[PDB]
Each structure stands twice: as structure tokens, then as C-alpha cells.
Design a protein around this ligand. Structure first.
Ligand code: HEC
Length: 251
């Protein structure tokens, strides 16, 4: 979630350009973003983003069942650019923005916006109203061709802030040995217990949450860290970059 980014990363974009959502949303899926080629200072314009995905395909949810995918994103604009305040947003654009609450990444990064989680079915494509700065009143800005970076995600991540795997990812054998037991963990609550008999005779019990399916059977020999399940992830995070020229009005 964007909140996870904000809570554990001071800056969403790293030196090499990767967005930190990618440290947890481990699958890549294209995204798109479009802004006008140029804009006059102190004027509102639109950033149209798209986080496409097959809406017919459901994902593994935290509770183990299957369900809809939700979306979120992080937008990195040049210093001085910001979310346009409502009073500056023309009605027809508000219409297209809909019911979304773009928030600044932090109070000190108003040029960095985020939104999500929100339903992917409804917000697969979003519009963001941006107010351009004015080089005249802001010494940190000039009449340049500026880059804009975007990170769009749809679907649950593979690992939490603590570094533990979510149930929406691949599970692996903790040790090498013979699977002498696969117990349908909990009563209709999902998950399994896979007992691996190590070569020394010790049995360790791997806990598999409900969601991913098993690809191993009783009596099967697995190598250390060998996969015991499929990869249930159907979502993904994508990055796109664009640019806009801050025009120098003239008279
Ligand atoms: C690891 C610390 C994460 C970072 C950094 C980001 N996300 Fe994440 N996200 C993560 C997990 C483990 C999950 C599942 C959480 C749960 O309660 O089950 C999520 C989920 C989302 C969602 C919801 C997706 C859905 O329900 O289909 C969204 C839309 C999402 N994440 C977006 C997102 C964005 C844009 C981020 C970058 C700024 C981001 N996440 C970072 C783990 C982590």
C-alpha cells in the first residue's frame, strides 16, 4: 500500500529510478501516464494514468479467498508542482477525477502524490489535477522540459514491511527431505502443514497459508528452498516516465 511506502521509505524513488513499491510488489505490469506536452505557469492540467489488467481474473486475498484487485500509485512531479486545490479545479475535470483523495507523500513532499487502495474495477484509469508552479515566484523552478515519474500498482504484494511473505506468493521448503505428511491445515480455514523428514530423521513442519496451491505430494523428495506451491500473484506494479515543458508566457 502507498501507506506502507510512506511509513518505511522517506523517498519513493531511488537513485537508479526504481520506485519502492517494487520492493514488495515483485511482479511487473505495464502502466501508462499522459500529461500535456506543455503548460503555462500557475495553471491546472491533467495527468491521466492507466493501470490495466484483466478484470476477469481474481486474486488471492489476505483471508485466503479469491477477489477483486485494488489499485494505488505514486506520482513524482518536479519541485513546485502540486495537486490543484478544489477551488482551482474546473467542474468538468472534477467530474473526471471522481471520488479520489490524492494525498502528498509527506507534508514536505507536496510534489509527490499518492492514492490507493481503491477498487481497480472503477479506478483502473485515473485523472490527477495538477497545478503548475511559476518560475517567477519560485526560484526552484525554471522554464524547462521536466520529467515526471509514475508508479502504478494493482494487486496484493508479496512481502510485508517486516520482511515476512504475504500469502500471495510462492512458498518454499525450509529444508531438504522427504515429505512424509501434508495436512489440510485448519478446518475449512485453509493452509497446509507440510512435514519434511530431514535426512537425519528430524521432521520440520512448514506452514503454508491458504491461497497458493500445492505442487508437491506425500512421498515426494524436495530440495532445500525448492518450491512447494505455485505463484498465485496475478497483479503487478509498473513504472512509466514522461515529461512536460513549463512554458514561459510572453508579452
Ligand atoms: C512492502 C513494505 C510494500 C510496499 C513498500 C508497498 N506495498 Fe503495496 N502492498 C503490500 C502488501 C503485502 C499488500 C497486501 C496487504 C494486505 O492487507 O493484504 C499490499 C497491497 C497493496 C494494495 C492493495 C492491492 C489489492 O488489494 O489488490 C495496493 C493498491 C498497493 N499495495 C499499492 C502499493 C503502491 C502504489 C505502493 C508504492 C507507493 C506500495 N503498494 C508499496 C506491500 C507493500
Amino acid at each position: 500500500y502507498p501507506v506502507f511506502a510512506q511509513q518505511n521509505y522517506a523517498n519513493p524513488r531511488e537513485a537508479n529510478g526504481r520506485i519502492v513499491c517494487a520492493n514488495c510488489h515483485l511482479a511487473q505490469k505495464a502502466v501508462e501516464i499522459e500529461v500535456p506536452q506543455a503548460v503555462l505557469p500557475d495553471t491546472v492540467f491533467e495527468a491521466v494514468i492507466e493501470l490495466p489488467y484483466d478484470k476477469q481474473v481474481k486474486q488471492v486475498l489476505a483471508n485466503g479467498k479469491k477477489g477483486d484487485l485494488n489499485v494505488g500509485m505514486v506520482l513524482i512531479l518536479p519541485e513546485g508542482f502540486e495537486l490543484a486545490p478544489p477551488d482551482r479545479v474546473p467542474a468538468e475535470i472534477k467530474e473526471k477525477v471522481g471520488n479520489l483523495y490524492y494525498q502528498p507523500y509527506s507534508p514536505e513532499q507536496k510534489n509527490i502524490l499518492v492514492v490507493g487502495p481503491v477498487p481497480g474495477k472503477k479506478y483502473s484509469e485515473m485523472v490527477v489535477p495538477i497545478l503548475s508552479p511559476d518560475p517567477a515566484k519560485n526560484k526552484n523552478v525554471s522554464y524547462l522540459k521536466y520529467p515526471i515519474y509514475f508508479g502504478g500498482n494493482r494487486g496484493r504484494g508479496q512481502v510485508y514491511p517486516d520482511g515476512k511473505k504475504s500469502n500471495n506468493t510462492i512458498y518454499n521448503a525450509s529444508a531438504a527431505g522427504k515429505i512424509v505428511a501434508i495436512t489440510a491445515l485448519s478446518e475449512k480455514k485453509g493452509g497446509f502443514e507440510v512435514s519434511i523428514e530431514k535426512a537425519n530423521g528430524e521432521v520440520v513442519v512448514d506452514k503454508i497459508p491458504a491461497g497458493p496451491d500445492l505442487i508437491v505430494k506425500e512421498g515426494q523428495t524436495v530440495q532445500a528452498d525448492q518450491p512447494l506451491t505455485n505463484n498465485p500473484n496475478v497483479g503487478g506494479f509498473g513504472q512509466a516516465e514522461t515529461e512536460i515543458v513549463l512554458q514561459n508566457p510572453a508579452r
